[PDB]
Amino acid sequence: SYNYVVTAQKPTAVNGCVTGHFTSAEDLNLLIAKNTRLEIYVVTAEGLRPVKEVGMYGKIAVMELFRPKGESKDLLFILTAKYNACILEYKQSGESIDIITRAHGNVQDRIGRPSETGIIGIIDPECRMIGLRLYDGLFKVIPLKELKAFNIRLEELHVIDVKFLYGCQAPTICFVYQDPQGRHVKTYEVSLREKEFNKGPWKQENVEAEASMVIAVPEPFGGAIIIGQESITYHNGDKYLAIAPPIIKQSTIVCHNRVDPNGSRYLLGDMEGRLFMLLLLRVELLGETSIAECLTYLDNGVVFVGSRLGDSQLVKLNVDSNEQGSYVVAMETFTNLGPIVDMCVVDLERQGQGQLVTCSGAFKEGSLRIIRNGIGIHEHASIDLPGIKGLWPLRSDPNRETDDTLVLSFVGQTRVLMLNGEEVEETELMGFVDDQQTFFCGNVAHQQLIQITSASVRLVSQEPKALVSEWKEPQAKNISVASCNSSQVVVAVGRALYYLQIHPQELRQISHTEMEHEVACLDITPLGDSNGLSPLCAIGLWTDISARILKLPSFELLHKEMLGGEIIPRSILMTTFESSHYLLCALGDGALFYFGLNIETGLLSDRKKVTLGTQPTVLRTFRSLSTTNVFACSDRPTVIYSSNHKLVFSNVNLKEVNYMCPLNSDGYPDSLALANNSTLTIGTIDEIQKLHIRTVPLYESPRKICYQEVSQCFGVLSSRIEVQDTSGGTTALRPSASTQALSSSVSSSKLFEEVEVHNLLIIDQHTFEVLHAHQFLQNEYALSLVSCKLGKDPNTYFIVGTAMVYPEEAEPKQGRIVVFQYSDGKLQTVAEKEVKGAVYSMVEFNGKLLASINSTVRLYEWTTEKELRTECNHYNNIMALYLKTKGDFILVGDLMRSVLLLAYKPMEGNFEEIARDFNPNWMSAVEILDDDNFLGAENAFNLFVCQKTTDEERQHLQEVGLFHLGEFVNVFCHGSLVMTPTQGSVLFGTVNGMIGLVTSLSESWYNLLLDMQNRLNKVIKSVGKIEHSFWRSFHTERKTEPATGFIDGDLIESFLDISRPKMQEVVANLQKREATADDLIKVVEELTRIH
Amino acid sequence: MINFDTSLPTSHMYLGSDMEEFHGRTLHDDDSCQVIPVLPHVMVMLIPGQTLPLQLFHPQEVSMVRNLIQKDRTFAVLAYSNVREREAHFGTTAEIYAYREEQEYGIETVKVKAIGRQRFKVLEIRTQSDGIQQAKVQILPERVLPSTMSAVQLQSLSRRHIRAFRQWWQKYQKRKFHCASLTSWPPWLYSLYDAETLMERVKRQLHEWDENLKDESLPTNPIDFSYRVAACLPIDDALRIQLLKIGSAIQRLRCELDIMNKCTSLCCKQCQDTEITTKNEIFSLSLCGPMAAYVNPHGYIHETLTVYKACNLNLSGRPSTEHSWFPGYAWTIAQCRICGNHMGWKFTATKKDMSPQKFWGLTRSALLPR
Ligand SMILES: Nc1cccc2c1CN([C@H]1CCC(=O)NC1=O)C2=O
């Protein structure tokens, strides 16, 4: 088995964040760690400026900046989970931005048990060393090229937290440690010249039983602040100050930040999302934020909430409390999909178009996330105007800076619409013709308007509206093609071309030429620092099929590209993306050619083809968020944008667009007038990016999700935390989805202080509103959820697998299988089947219901009497958490990667154990790829694939795929977000918000790409100089085997990104059959289409 | 309360004192292939850590171990799938720790005390001219896994370390597995795979057998603890082999708890239906647990389980102190009332002041958890 794994959506969750002067000793920087990703920013004081976004070959564990003595800016230390240590410097020179490795190595010990409270990466204030607590009972020291390291035997094994003390002649570390006697704070002096530890400056003072964090406080204070559950203590030898505020009792302080560089103000943060200010001791509650993983104070009053459970934030710390009393106000919310605990692919909106709905986030940050491939349009006006052949915005008032007019072209006709705010009205523009189809019109030079029709070129004055000039072809022949800017016009009359200039009350015929063939399309867009005057005319011709760059006014040929084919160019456009000049040429067949253009020579380089529609594409330029874009109108409307100096094409979610133009009116600001075959729509464009994310906050934990088409709704299992009140029940912490349901219901019992309440939510597949909420029983933990039809019955039921959880019980002794019918906006309970265990998983099996009751696998039959009837029972000796199926074969999965294959015998009415595997390792998810293969997520962020003559051979499974993903997969799902090279498609949702795609490959394609990977790795420069082969190596505390049966899609896709002479280097002798660079472009292009 | 010295059985005094002691330890690398001798008359299964007393008197077995002392000091003990057809796919290495040579009655005789070390997989059983076999075996590695949460927590919440202490165990679950919220499983599920948790669930029954147990004696390590517990469970050979295949301490404790809960009544293997004793009568008269391997004067190893009350037993002959495995107690042969199957012995105190005044030493081969 050979598979392909690629990132569909990068990780979104924030793992850590820092502030310093990395880019320049002037610019205030904010560095965000999104696992494998590093986001570098500048604090704009009027926003947040994104400079660069680099990806690494490791999961970031440590990320702290440092400036050792004489340095131009800051040096960044990064330590990966695989112990990849590196020092990175920022390097900028014009448009080129590159991260530079100053020192790198691997600090992993030949032996040792990785410590309980994770990896700790601390730096001496004077930049004298790097302190690492990776293993219990040792202290690794890296003095700040090959990153040389040494250990110091630390006597106190169980270290909670540690920091490098400030104001020291000799480096000192202060750490909270725990022994059987108690939990006490201690100090040690680290000597480099002695390579060992010596007694600390002060005594081993006893601290709070739950003392969790050590805060390194600067001069003139010195010493350390120890944060516990109820107490905040301070130690400095003889100087001691112990405060116990009741305001911090509720939740534990998990993260801090320094506000004043001297050490007088600290930002504290607890697990519930509260924000505290530790003043220098006094604590004050500022307000509520997202559940912060990390906090960063930056500039004046602005704060960055780095969240992992929910959307990250930008918040303001006003000294003035509002009506509610909060000193915290929410500026900007940054989408975080992580964690994805469940998900499903549904054909919402249009069939064939895949959409991904996920159970994302936790607790108050709980939400549903809808991820749709492609940009969207927000409609504001809709007018019935069929068969529009052209659209143009106008400003009838020269004094006004906004559009107040919209000119429409039709078959031998022209209509004019006036925009009186939000009101669109049919009017007539004086000077313009209504009886002729228009090729162009708009605002031109010397406060005038132009109208190019099939008959003439009309120049109209703005005060008053009247005809000033009118150009016609000498023999009164019709204008075929037309291009116009502000001061220039180039028109075609078959083979003939005419160049005119727009002067006051005059259209001046500068030059004219005859072409080799009939003119198909024209463009005179002024590019670069060309003040409204273009010295280039881009032209497409019939029969010879060519894109030609001509010089104005001479009409002299500079370049002629031979497009090839019988299909003639329909649209041609000169454009500028990310300061780079391009030529865009659309063909009648739907194909689009794109090259880079040299403004001086007129040379077309780096020819690239892209298939858009089936219809001839029409290219119109538009400005979105102070950036130039190209809207490609076809039956697959697309936006042509720029990202890392490479053109990106993202589909617009619209059935078809024929013509469009941008409209900035008083009623419709920074809008797009879009036309199809039947109607004119006026609206706004979303964010220009590949995928779209709709956030449906639940304000509670979503756990499981599935879909019912017959009901046009989603079934969602969700839990809310409620505290025990002074009554025989519980009270909520805040309103949430399950509380605020349209119609509410509760389970009726028949079976024999912070509580978790479980609910089945019913959410409409359009609005996403809580139509219904069925609250489960007291102490009932809802586990599995499935939407299916069973037996002979034609009604689709929502089935839930529960478990009765009590603190005394270890393994749930009770559970239910609850059958619900969703009709009349309420859930009718059809069947309540009590089982002697936890219903960990359920699946529809060929018309029956397969469910797992702890260690047993039951098959239930749906009778006429509408009650699930026990058929056959397989007793597994392994807990059946995972339960997946394909035909008459079942997959059983344990948390310890103990897989066993079952098969239901139709004639026998029993289960037959095909093959089993028992390789202890934590398993988080598992999916069936095909009849013989199956994919799973194994411990230490890895993926794997198990495959299927003698009885001993056939009864034992074979591990054919091993891969270090770098992510913790929670869900696998068969589907695709896109409307053959590869076999099948499995999407995966991770803890960090990363979505991925896994597909199958042929023996040949696998080897082709595996060979290509090794070659690509010899070219590509790695951040921190980490070997790709190492990063992808299957890794656990024990074995670290190289990756097998897997292709890194993310590495293979960066072939389309490398320089063309480097592509040539990679393809040189690649292959036996020979491999062309243009062949490998097609193969790799094809693979980018899967997602 | 019991006054008997629970250390006395573990030290195999009947074997005699004044034995040559060996300290030095040999351990073979994991997955490594080794060729180890097998003792022709050992038919029991040894668990790693379990003490195996031997009394050898056959010239070939005597010469074998005599030569063994000069080198490795380790031999292989096979877990027989079919004891009659001498079929074994698994086993454990045994390292000699106590040794003694005697010459008597015209023969050269040797007494050893060995301990289970490393489990193995049988590759081939070659045989020698003198009768003693050799086994090409592959060492099975002990598979140690990190916390279930270790992978999911690479964050700020990491620095949350581990009657009346009932709430401690709930606070422990709530704290340790808090990050289960990031996953698709609840904290109570993760506890079913927590080594510390599963150990406490086992320790719960280990205190029901050892009323005078001090936690200092018990191993902190789940590897040692899972094994110690396996060696004192009165279960059939089919079930013991299944436990020996287990590579993880977690999988083992989970298996052991399952056995411990289903364990109710112990019957006569021969009758199948005659009930002899129950789980409630089981008690640890030794530190090794309620069950241990002991040798009779003819080298036959009887793994005996200590119970306070037994039932369909009939005794024969008068008590004897000769070669007693529990010093201060006299044994008398006990058999099934129905079929006459030798079930073990009734141990009766030789002094009025001893506690317990009587108990039963039942041989696990005679028993059936049916
Ligand atoms: N005397 C004699 C002769 C033949 C077999 C056996 C014995 C004594 N014995 C057992 C009796 C119980 C004990 O505590 N130690 C033993 O050694 C036998 O299994």
Ligand SMILES: [Zn+2]
């Ligand atoms: Zn009997």
